[PDB]
């Protein structure tokens, strides 16, 4: 089950993929709306993978241990430069969450892409599968791949004051190590913006 994804000049290859989960759409809707007056431009230099550390999954983590990451986070690269140098921005996300442990480990993680989420209760976690999601199960895979489009109230938004998407990782079943399992699993995220459009260039600092 070898899958190789290529964003910009960055590549990511996994040999234990269960496919790509497209969420809410398989393509992008119109980007040339009446709110930008035709001044939008595409920045293909920002469609690259950047790496962030989500958490450390251990036998301690019981069900309901939930970690959230609002995707337009602190980016030290071209994407952050666009955020600081443009008023309005638009993009979707291509998220690859890796929990590399061992095939002798047990338990299960649920990786979801929730729009407009700030906090979640334990009961609502039971329906977290309503969102574009995958399961990371160490017996069968160690990588979840989800693609979502731009999705918001407006066609373009100000990412300084609004985070449309949230990557959510929850522990469905506790990690079991037994004898031959990994003591802990470091859950990381590899995220790539897709179809980046900017409008309204800002003055210099």
């Amino acid at each position: 089950r070898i899958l190789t994804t290529r964003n910009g000049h960055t590549t990511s290859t996994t040999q234990s993929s269960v496919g790509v989960t497209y969420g809410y759409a398989t393509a992008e809707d119109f980007v040339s709306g009446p709110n930008t007056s035709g001044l939008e431009t595409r920045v293909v230099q920002a469609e690259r993978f950047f790496k962030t550390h989500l958490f450390d999954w251990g036998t301690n983590d019981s069900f309901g241990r939930c970690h959230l990451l609002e995707l337009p986070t602190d980016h030290k690269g071209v994407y952050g430069s666009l955020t600081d140098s443009y008023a309005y921005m638009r993009n979707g996300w291509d998220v690859e969450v890796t929990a590399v442990g061992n095939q002798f480990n047990g338990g299960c993680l649920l990786v979801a892409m929730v729009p407009e989420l700030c906090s979640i209760t334990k009961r609502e976690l039971y329906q977290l599968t309503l969102f574009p999601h995958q399961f990371i199960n160490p017996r069968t895979n160690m990588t979840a791949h989800i693609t979502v489009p731009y999705l918001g109230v407006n066609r373009y938004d100000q990412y300084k004051v609004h985070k449309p998407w949230t990557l959510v990782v929850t522990v469905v079943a506790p990690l079991t190590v037994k004898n031959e399992g990994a003591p802990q699993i470091k859950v990381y995220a590899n995220i790539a913006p897709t179809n980046v459009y900017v409008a309204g260039e800002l003055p210099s600092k």
Partner: antibody, heavy 123, light 109 residues
Framework: EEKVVESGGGLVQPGGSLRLSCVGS????????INWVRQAPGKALEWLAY????????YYADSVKGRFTISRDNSRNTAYLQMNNLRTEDTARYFC????????????????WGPGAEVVVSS | QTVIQEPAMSVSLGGTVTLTCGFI?????????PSWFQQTPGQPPRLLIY???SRPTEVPSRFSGAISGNKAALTITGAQAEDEADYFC??????????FGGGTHLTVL
């Protein structure tokens, strides 16, 4: 620099109550778990309490379960340890610890330690 | 309690020493997530080893962690004069029971 400071200690009659305050600077207090430990003069460290990022999971040591209460306020970048029914065995230096480090996003890290506040319980 | 450490150990300058951390009844594995701290008098402890083999970036390469003989081991190789301190052992055993060792006082001759 990532640092934490503890306040609210002192000398208190046994049977009383008091609240330790932990103030953290140099990091996002919302993204880190907080442990409260204590060290008796000339003795070994003893872990007391643990709270997660959003106060959803809270654990106490069996010696201080029910007696103590750990909470946090992320807006104020503070953590609180309210101690009630203090006994003479609790005279110690209390440390507020931030569990988290580059390459360590669990509770078994205990990286950042404060100078600790002294609590003296005697009659 | 239930955690056994050597009460005190001595190492020659530039030598190699191994501090050890066991249970009274049982084996220390990776599931216990052993951690090693160093403390000097009048100073808060600082983390040396986490996950029983990992060390922070700022910690020098002298300190190493391992799990050997069903016991957690902290090895100091080429000990300097700054290594004379009390070394503590944190072990995880269920969510609400975090154990600490007695503490080994290491002195450099």
């Amino acid at each position: 620099e990532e640092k934490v400071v503890e306040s609210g200690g002192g000398l208190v009659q046994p049977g009383g109550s008091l609240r330790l305050s932990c103030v953290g600077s140099g990091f996002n207090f919302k993204n880190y778990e907080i442990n409260w430990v204590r060290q008796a003069p000339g003795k070994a460290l003893e872990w007391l309490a643990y709270i997660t990022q959003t106060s959803d999971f809270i654990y106490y040591a069996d010696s201080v379960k029910g007696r103590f209460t750990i909470s946090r306020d992320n807006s104020r970048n503070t953590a609180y340890l309210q101690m009630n029914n203090l006994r003479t065995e609790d005279t110690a230096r209390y440390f507020c610890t931030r569990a988290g480090l580059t390459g360590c996003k669990s509770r078994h890290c205990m990286y950042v330690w404060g100078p600790g506040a002294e609590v003296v319980v005697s009659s | 309690q239930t955690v056994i450490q050597e009460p005190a150990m001595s190492v020659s300058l530039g030598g190699t020493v191994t501090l050890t951390c066991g249970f009274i009844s049982g084996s220390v594995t990776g599931t216990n997530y052993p951690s090693w701290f160093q403390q000097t008098p009048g100073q808060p402890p600082r983390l040396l080893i986490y996950y029983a083999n990992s060390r922070p970036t700022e910690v020098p390469s002298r300190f190493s962690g391992a799990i050997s003989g069903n016991k957690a081991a902290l090895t100091i190789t080429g000990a300097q004069a700054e290594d004379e301190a009390d070394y503590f052992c944190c072990l995880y055993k269920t969510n609400n029971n975090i154990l600490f060792g007695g503490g080994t006082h290491l002195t450099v001759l």
